[PDB]
Design a protein around this ligand. Structure first.
Ligand SMILES: Nc1cccc([N+](=O)[O-])c1C(=O)N[C@@H]1C[C@H]1c1ccc(Cl)c(F)c1
Ligand SMILES: Nc1cccc([N+](=O)[O-])c1C(=O)N[C@@H]1C[C@H]1c1ccc(Cl)c(F)c1
Ligand code: NA
Lengths: 301, 302
């Protein structure tokens, strides 16, 4: 037993991290087969960043303007192109450590591991969720741009996030590996602010089911709720609406514990109303919303 | 910005995890050069586990009784011996992925990364502290025995923990890689319990410094304290005593934030006395004690 925010083992991703330099800017790139993926803003000066014309900046670059360093070795850039907000640098060597992989674009509520890196060198691994407002609450310093988020279900790495910037409130914004931003964000210095954030209700319920599985029942009550009534109350505490999809997804945890979904919803309503009264749930004094139904099944069963 | 429970990248350790089977028991082993390290209890049945004579059980085993699988390949065991509570299986192949490493024993309060594994296959990585009571609050199912804890200190992996068992309260117990248990535990089925635990005061203060660095400042006040006065407070709340050594270690964070350690202790005193009054610190409604001063500096400056 126990319940921990657990990340995927990072080794398959570590062997793909490289350093990309352009001019005086250095950041991280992801080296898969013979392509290095990194944020296109590597081509900008900070002046450029207010209103950058990336097509104009990029046409002025040659291959040899891009320095790619994989551990100790320089790779030769033999092509470049831009796809959305990512630069794809074609290199002369396929990465021999390329894992089985895919690119997947995730939805708010989904969790993933982040391998934080500086100068193409991995620093640490931690677990994150895509927030309803399409940001992530990461831990990133200057130089972390191009660090990636991923899941590994089986031996296949699913890359879902590449880090581009920190917003003024200290949360983080980035793209999928096709270079499409999550959220309304752009790789420009403008007034862009994260929408107010909400709690990921389906994940809190999942975690309540994890608490029950692990022997913890104090927060249950004799009540049920309709879905609509649950949503009317939940929204008053800045919780995301729960949809029939979410109810469906929680079906297996429901069957395992013998607690119907809307019965667990009634428990959540009461917790929001009463707080915890000096108690903890799975060691937390707050309701945790960064474990998905899938993650609870993975870690608990 | 931001502050997360962060593990070391696990790649160097993943390439050393193997599956060890003996009879019906399968668990995880650590393959370094030509030795596989795993819990000696792999040799026991359930009955044996009540009152095991390890030396007697072991002498009855041949090399071929140990099936070691590294991914798809069987390794051939060519020798076996015991050091304390760990079994050392000599194999015919050196691990080509052996990192630079050392075996180090950690002190209570120190943190490390755990790579959780099942059937020699790594499944997750998380960050733990060695509790004052010598347990760890891990996350482990059956099959996890032989999973390892480590720090990385350059390109050098320092292995500090190997998982042996879960205690009745759902916390975990294990050994260093020389097979010495952390805490007063034994590898047999008897009644064993975690002792009462305490909060790691130096780590809480570290985390308060992390909060300040990240712009969370509401708990700072104009007051200061002395070590002795604070220590009277710590004792009352089941916090570890703070020593001059602790104060010394927090020196760098003190200089960077302009909050002296005993200044921050005055903050912590007030938190323990008055609670958080509806507020959070780095997203938490409890005081976090599983980041060391070094961890905060490493994450907040490196
Ligand atoms: N300077 C930082 C400090 C701490 C942490 C981070 N971070 O998590 O990346 C940064 C940061 O935002 N770095 C980016 C180069 C900066 C940039 C600035 C604006 C736009 Cl639109 C962009 F795409 C890129
Ligand atoms: N029962 C469990 C349930 C869930 C997770 C775990 N776990 O964390 O490993 C266990 C557990 O303790 N497994 C050990 C083989 C069992 C054993 C039993 C007793 C003694 Cl003293 C020993 F060294 C070993
Ligand atoms: Na003070």
């Amino acid at each position: 037993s126990g319940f921990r925010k657990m990340a995927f083992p990072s080794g398959k991703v570590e062997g793909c991290m490289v350093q990309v330099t352009c001019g005086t800017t250095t950041l991280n790139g992801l080296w898969l087969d013979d392509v290095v993926y990194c944020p296109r803003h590597v081509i900008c000066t900070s002046e450029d960043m207010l209103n950058p014309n990336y097509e104009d900046l990029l046409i002025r670059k040659s291959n040899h303007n891009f320095l790619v360093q994989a551990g100790n070795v320089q790779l030769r850039v033999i092509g470049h192109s831009m796809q959305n907000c990512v630069l794809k640098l074609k290199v002369d060597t396929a990465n021999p450590k390329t894992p089985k992989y895919k690119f997947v674009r995730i939805q708010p509520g989904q969790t993933f591991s982040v391998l934080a890196c500086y100068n193409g060198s991995p620093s640490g691994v931690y677990q994150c969720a895509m927030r309803p407002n399409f940001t992530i609450k990461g831990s990133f310093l200057n130089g972390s741009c191009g660090s990636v988020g991923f899941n590994i279900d089986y031996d296949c790495v699913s890359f879902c996030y590449m880090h581009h910037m920190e917003l003024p409130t200290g949360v983080h914004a980035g793209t999928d590996l096709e270079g499409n931003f999550y959220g309304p964000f752009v790789d420009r210095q403008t007034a862009q602010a994260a929408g107010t954030d909400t709690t990921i209700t389906v994940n809190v319920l999942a975690w309540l089911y994890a608490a029950v599985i692990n022997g913890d029942r104090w927060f249950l009550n004799r009540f049920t709720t309709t879905l609509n009534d649950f949503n009317l109350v939940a929204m008053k505490y800045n919780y995301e609406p729960l949809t029939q999809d979410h109810v469906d997804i929680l079906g297996p945890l429901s069957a395992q514990t013998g607690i119907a979904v809307l019965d667990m919803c009634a428990s959540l309503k009461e917790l929001l109303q009463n707080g915890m009264n000096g108690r903890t749930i799975l060691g937390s004094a707050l309701l945790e919303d960064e474990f998905t139904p899938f993650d609870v099944v993975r870690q608990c069963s």
